[PDB]
């Protein structure tokens, strides 16, 4: 029954906080920078290394200011939380593309209203 396509998740996860690729990347990077210092400490594990080399190859904007700006211009809409991270991480080209991507956008907004958002996202990208 759990299907993000139809917007439905357990109660504990519905009140979750969405995270972006660049966001988790900078979080893990700051964690590594804090952990490498202070000698006599249990170094990182394979999970951290794979997560780091996984999220580093998908950093669309390393600037926390750009992350803040993009999340701010995105949250001004009426889309759910799930629609903020997927789209912010994917960054498609055109509105028809984004609608074919996320089936919830099918008939939820206007073609040009989404095309402008996609263009703004592609421009904010570094």
């Amino acid at each position: 029954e759990e299907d993000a396509s139809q917007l439905i998740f357990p109660k504990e996860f519905e009140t979750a906080e969405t995270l972006l690729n660049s966001e988790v990347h900078m979080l893990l990077e700051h964690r590594k920078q804090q952990n490498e210092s202070a000698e006599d400490e249990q170094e990182l594990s394979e999970v951290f290394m794979k997560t780091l080399n996984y999220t580093a190859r998908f950093s669309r904007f390393k600037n926390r200011e750009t992350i803040a700006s993009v999340r701010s211009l995105l949250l001004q809409k009426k889309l759910h939380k799930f629609e903020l991270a997927c789209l912010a991480n994917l960054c498609p080209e055109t509105a028809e593309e984004s609608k074919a991507l996320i089936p919830s956008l099918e008939g939820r907004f206007e073609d040009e209203e989404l095309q402008q958002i996609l263009d703004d996202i592609q421009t904010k990208r570094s």
């Binding site: 396509s5 969405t18 893990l28 999970v47 951290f48 190859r57 498609p92 593309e97």
Partner: protein, 171 residues
Amino acid sequence: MFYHISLEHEILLHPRYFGPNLLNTVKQKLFTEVEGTCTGKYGFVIAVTTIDNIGAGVIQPGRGFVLYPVKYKAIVFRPFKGEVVDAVVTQVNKVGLFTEIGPMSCFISRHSIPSEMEFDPNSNPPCYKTMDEDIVIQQDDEIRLKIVGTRVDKNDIFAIGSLMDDYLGLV
């Protein structure tokens, strides 16, 4: 998908750890415990971001073990069905295409993959070519995929995908 939630966990502390570094030991124990683990309720936890507060330790009767209920704000990775996420192809085999969904590794099958994607095993690096080429899905390449099924193999997440699309993947 990665999220940031506040979880709780109770941990016992042997009387030997009492002293000025009691709180430090509790935090250290929490880190060594809830990091990289997996539970069927919240999923696989990557790491812990912070700790809200350290509950009041309740010494047990007839046992020097005092338990602390600590609440920690940590990130968790629990992929659901239908979501689309990125990954890097790790290996191409005639049995299917391998990738890496962060802490998860998916696998695609020829049946799902279109009829164009035939095989190339005689070369040193196997690769699925959409019949008439035009797009490479070899190793060390960013490919998206739709999680059409999930699974947790005893604290081990492994989802499954499909492929027969062009605009969220490699263009």
